[model samples]
Target: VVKFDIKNQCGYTVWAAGLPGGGKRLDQGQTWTVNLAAGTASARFWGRTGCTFDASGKGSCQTGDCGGQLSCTVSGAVPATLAEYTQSDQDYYDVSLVDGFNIPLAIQPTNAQCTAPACKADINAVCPSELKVDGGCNSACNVFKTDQYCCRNAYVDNCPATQYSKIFKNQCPQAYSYAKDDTATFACASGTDYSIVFCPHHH
Candidate 1:
C-alpha cells in the first residue's frame, strides 16, 4: 500500500504519477481531501476498481497546455498552496508483493517553466527592455512575467500593467490586475479591465 501528500505554491497545478505494485486494488472507506487556499476550489476522488493506474494532478489552466491527461485546474485566489490532502487517519491498501511494488512515488508541478527564447522575445517585444523574465504568469498558460512586465502570446491584449499586479491576479483576483498580452492588434486603452478566462489549450 502507498500513500502521500502533494503541495503547491504559486497556485500552479499539481499532479502525481502511478504508484508501485501491479494489479493494485483500493480498499473501501478510502478518503481524500484536496485542500486549497481559502476562496479556492478543490476536488476529491476515491479509488474505484479497474481505474487506470497512472499520473493524476491539477487540470490544465483553461488558457494553456501543460502536459499530463489526468489533472485538475484551480483558478482565482485560494488560501492554501496547491497540494493533495489524503486521509490523515490510518489507512492502508493490500496488494500482492510484486516487483516494483515498493518504488518511490514522485510528485511534480505541471506548470511548464519558460525556457524558450521565443517566449522571452514575445515578452520583450511588448515590455520595455528593463523587465527581466521572472517566470510564467500562470501554471498552465505559456505567459511569462518579469519584475516590471508580464507578457504572453496566448492573450496579447490582456497583459497587466505591473508585474506584481499581473502575478497576483493570476491566482488572487482581489489583490492585483491582469490582461491578455496579445488580445488586439491595436494597443488596448490604458487601464482597460478584462475578464478572467480559462486557457486549457494554450501552448
Candidate 2:
C-alpha cells in the first residue's frame, strides 16, 4: 500500500479535498493520513481556502472548491496547487500547476527510490497581472483561455509550454508546468509512504 501523510502548515485553516471521503478540516499545524492501493491512479489532493461548512456538510470555498461540498465527489476548481500521484512498480508523484495554484505544497517521498518534488515557491509574488486570481496565481490558459496557452486546438502534442508555464517551471523545476510534461522522475517500490506538506518552507 502507499500511505500519504497530509500535513497542513499554512498558518490557516483549509479544507483538504481529494478522493471520496478524503475531505476533512485541516487546521494549522494539523495532519491527516490516507492510504492508497498499489495500483491507484493520479489521485489528486489539494487545499481549499475560505471555506464555511454547516452541520449538513454543505458550504463553499473561495478557492479549490469541489462542487461546494464538504465531501468532494468531483475534482477541485481551477487555480489549485495539486498533489497528484500514481503508484505502480515505480511510484509517480508531483505537485501540478496545470490548473493553476492556490496554495503552496510539496511531496516528500520516503523510501530508496523516490526523490521529492516540491512547489513551495511564492508564486503569487510574481504572478502576472492578467493571470492573477483571488488567492493565488493562475495559468495563462486558465485566464486568457486561448489555444496557445491551453495547448489545445488542432495541434495538441505540438503545443509547447508557454512563457507563463516557464515562470512556474523556473520556480518549481521538478513539478509539472504543462500538460505535455511526461516525465515522472522519482521512482520507488509499491510500499513507499509519501508526505504531502503545505506551505513547505518555500522550497
Candidate 3:
C-alpha cells in the first residue's frame, strides 16, 4: 500500500479533497491519512478554501469543489494547487500548477533519497489581473482556452512557456508549470510513504 499523510499546515481551515480517497475538513495542524493500493494511478489530492458544508456533507467551495460534494468521487475544479501521484513499480509524483494554484502544497517522500516537489509559492500575491479569481490565481490556459496557453493541438508537443506560465515557474520551479513539464515530475520506489503538506512553510 502507498500511505499518505495529508496535512493542513496553513493557519486557516482547508477542506482537503482527494480522489480514490475522498475529502475531509482539516483545521490547522490537522492531518488526514490515506492509503492506496499498490497499483493505483492518476490519483490527485488538493485543498478547498472558503467552503461550507451541510450536515449531510453537501456544499460548495470557493476553490477545488468536486460537483459541490464534500466527498470527492471525481476530480476537483481548476485554479487549485494539486498533489498528483501514480504508483507502479516506480512511484511518479508531482505538484502541478498546470491547472493553477490556490494553496501552497508540498510533496515529500518519507522513506527514500528521492527529490521532493513543492508548490509552496504564494502566487496569489503576485497573480496577474486577468488571471486572478475570487480565491485563486488561474493559469493562462484556464483563463484563455487557447492552444498556445492550453498546450493543445499543434502546441501539444511544442508548448513552450509563455510569459504567463513563467509567472508560475519563476516562483514554483518544483511544480509542473505546463502540460508537458516532465522535469518537474519526481520519482521514487513504490514503497515510499508520502507527506503531502498544505502551506508547508510559514509565510
Candidate 4:
C-alpha cells in the first residue's frame, strides 16, 4: 500500500493512500474514512490490477496481492492561488497507471496545509513591478528600461525603435527591440509556486 502523511494546520497528521481494489466485489474501489474533530479523510491501501485477471477466467490470478512487488508514481503542484483551482491556472497532476487497467484512486477529503501569505511575501513584493512592466511596455527593452536615454529622457527617439517598427513591420507590428541584459527583474512566464511529492521507490 502507498501510504503517506499530510500534516494539517493544527499539527494533526492525515494519512492517505491510493487503494487499487478492495470493496464490495474485490475489483471495486473505496476510500477509507476516518472521522476527526476537523473532518474525515481516507487511509491508503494497495491492491492488484484488474487486468491481471483474464476475461475467460482461464489465467491464474491473485486478488489484492502484489506478490512482494509494488510500484507507484506521484506528482503534485502548488497553485498560485486557491482561486486558481477552478480557473485555467489550476495545478496539474500527471499520474500514470501502468499494469493496471484503471486509473489511480485518491482518498477523499485530502487536505494540504494552506500556504501562508508570509510564504509568498517576497513574490508579492515583485509582482507589481513585473505586472507594470509587462502590461505597460510591450517591448522587453522598455520593460527592462535597458535604454538609458529612454529611461532618463523618456524621448521616443532616445530609445532605439524596435525592429518591428522598422524591418518586420508587416510580420510583427508590435514587436520591440529588447536588451540582452540578464539582470532585469522579470516575472517568469510561468507563475512561481513550489510543489514536490515523490515515492522513495523511484528515487
Best by TM-score: 3
Stretches of candidate 4 exceeding 4 Å from the true structure: 1-45, 50-65, 68-101, 107-109, 112-203
- After superposition, the stretches of candidate 1 with alpha carbons farther than 4 Å from their true spots are 1-64, 72-146, 150-173, 178-203
Per-residue lDDT tens digits for candidate 2, residues 1-203, read 57788989988997888873458899998888887775676578998988999998989898888888888989988888988877655666788898998888888887745688888788888898888878878888788887888778754768777789999898878788877665534556667788888899751
Model 3, position 42, has a per-residue lDDT of: 58
- For each candidate, give its TM-score against the true structure: 0.18, 0.91, 0.96, 0.17
The residue-level lDDT of candidate 3 at 109 comes to: 96
lDDT of 2: 0.81
| lDDT (Cα atoms) of all candidates against the true structure | 0.22, 0.81, 0.90, 0.22
How large an RMSD does model 1 have?
A: 19.4
Tens digits of per-residue lDDT, candidate 4, 64-153, equal 222222221221111011100111233222111111111112211122432211111112122323322211112223234444413244
Arranged by lDDT, best first: 3, 2, 1, 4
- The better candidate by TM-score, 2 or 4, is 2
Ranking by TM-score: 3, 2, 1, 4
lDDT of 3 by residue, 26-71 (tens): 9999999998887777579999999999999998999999988998
